[PDB]
Amino acid sequence: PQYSTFHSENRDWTFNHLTVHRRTGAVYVGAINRVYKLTGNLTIQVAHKTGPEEDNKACYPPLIVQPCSEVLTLTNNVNKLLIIDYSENRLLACGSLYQGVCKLLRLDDLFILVEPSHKKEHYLSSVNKTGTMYGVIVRSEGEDGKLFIGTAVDGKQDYFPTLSSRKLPRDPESSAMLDYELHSDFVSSLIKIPSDTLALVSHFDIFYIYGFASGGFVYFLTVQPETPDLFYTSRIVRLCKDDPKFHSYVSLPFGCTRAGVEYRLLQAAYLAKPGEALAQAFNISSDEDVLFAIFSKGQKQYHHPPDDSALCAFPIRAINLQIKERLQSCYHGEGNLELNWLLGKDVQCTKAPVPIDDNFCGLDINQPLGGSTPVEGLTLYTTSRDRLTSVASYVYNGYSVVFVGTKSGKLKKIRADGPPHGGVQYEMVSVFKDGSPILRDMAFSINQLYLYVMSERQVTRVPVESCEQYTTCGECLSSGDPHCGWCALHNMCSRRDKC
Ligand SMILES: *[C@@H]1O[C@H](CO)[C@@H](O[C@@H]2O[C@H](CO)[C@@H](O[C@@H]3O[C@H](CO[C@H]4O[C@H](CO[C@H]5O[C@H](CO)[C@@H](O)[C@H](O)[C@@H]5O)[C@@H](O)[C@H](O[C@H]5O[C@H](CO)[C@@H](O)[C@H](O)[C@@H]5O)[C@@H]4O)[C@@H](O)[C@H](O[C@H]4O[C@H](CO)[C@@H](O)[C@H](O)[C@@H]4O)[C@@H]3O)[C@H](O)[C@H]2NC(C)=O)[C@H](O)[C@H]1NC(C)=O
Ligand SMILES: *[C@@H]1O[C@H](CO)[C@@H](O[C@@H]2O[C@H](CO)[C@@H](O)[C@H](O)[C@H]2NC(C)=O)[C@H](O)[C@H]1NC(C)=O
């Protein structure tokens, strides 16, 4: 079949991130040294150089803010982040160069709208490997709005915070760009990895894999080595949208297990609406959000992972409630804070007469809050033949179809039914005809019809339905591909709306 494609114009200039404009269908593909804007049918429009440029990783503060007495080199710019900012009609993009430059581009032509100041803190991270940084832009009505950002900091606990909320202001001209939402001597909208922890655990860092806006909160999904073989722990991090002091912080481990085997290494995630099936399963409305995630076996070697992988669903209501009860108890003197990487010691929960209302936003006591009581997600599908890499979901006609990418370059189409079944992988499709890993990022067309899927050197527009393959009614209504109805006055298997 003749799928739409976009190859990398270069052997070195590989793809990093991807996103689609949900109203115009422009395909923005962040890549090494480039940030291409494409059209719906993946035909090249605006190429955009971001690299390479002269730089050196040892230079801090970065070359942009001062000359540095080091041997410079022609260093590459890896696209670490790529969020469309819908409210202010602009793209945001960050890179590995000059200690983590963020540039606000323009949607129309990718022309640099705003350079951030030459204040060294406006630069985010010297880390030049992908899938360690994620951001969420939150512009709830009334204020200028902000960027919540988390990133790996490669041992420089002084230079870059692990997670912070920056100002992303209305006036594109403004110098306020990427200043901390708050910055006094002590209280600030940033969390820094203490030196104590970086000593006590060798190459200690926190990789951020996904983040999302949900209701009154911002959530970040983080993988890290664990305080005393190599023990890794995937987590959920939750902050109030309106909290500058960062007092609202609370962090719980998460994972899912099926058939005695347990999966606790987050490889991907993706927020979406719940199935009809899945909605009944979690006792949520068909409004509320469900986070779909992928996990590896155990908690061993995140850097060299196995093959046993598992898709699972977490309804936000469960997270929001498992947190609510964690806070609850801790506010009645029960247990400890239990967050040893950031606290560096044991801190006893303070019993306080404070009601933990449905959306409570922290005080200066019992924070930051942790926990050692995993948030268990409902498994939907497993395998050990192929490793799973990416995840993306949506709801067609009550049925939640979930798409999953593989190490071998395959996209599975799983329909989620919930207990006791879980999910039925109704169809597989080989996207990359050589067996190239699919990358964490995947997104739909404006009107659901396609899903953009990408490897290091490829981007392909794969359609959701291909019911054509099903020739007879006995094969059509047999596969369980929720799109496919058998057609009357046509005598073929296709989608509902075109019949
Ligand atoms: C989503 O939410 C729903 C709704 O909240 C939830 O379903 C409830 O689950 C809870 C907790 O598991 C159940 O509570 C248990 O109830 C036990 C007794 O239940 C019987 O009695 C119910 C009331 O009967 C009265 O009203 C009916 C009118 O319908 C009338 O005819 C009767 O004569 C009587 O007056 C009755 O509704 C219920 O019957 C339904 O449910 C059964 C399945 O259980 C189903 O097969 C039937 O078809 C029917 O729809 C049933 O006959 C009770 O003994 C038990 O108490 C123990 O545990 C608690 C908590 O640990 C202790 O406090 C207690 O001391 C005992 O140890 C428990 O409270 C509740 O029955 C369910 N409600 C319904 C409507 O089904 C789902 O779980 C949620 N879904 C998911 C996926 O999570
Ligand atoms: C990320 O930066 C590192 C530098 O720290 C790069 O690794 C270097 O690669 C060159 C060859 O291109 C070698 O000569 C050096 O020995 C490497 N240095 C170190 C410290 O390992 C790496 O290539 C960069 N990655 C990307 C994707 O650009």
Ligand SMILES: *[C@@H]1O[C@H](CO)[C@@H](O)[C@H](O)[C@H]1NC(C)=O
């Ligand atoms: C894709 O469609 C566009 C119109 O948006 C057209 O200009 C372009 O030529 C098409 N590309 C290919 C590769 O056929």
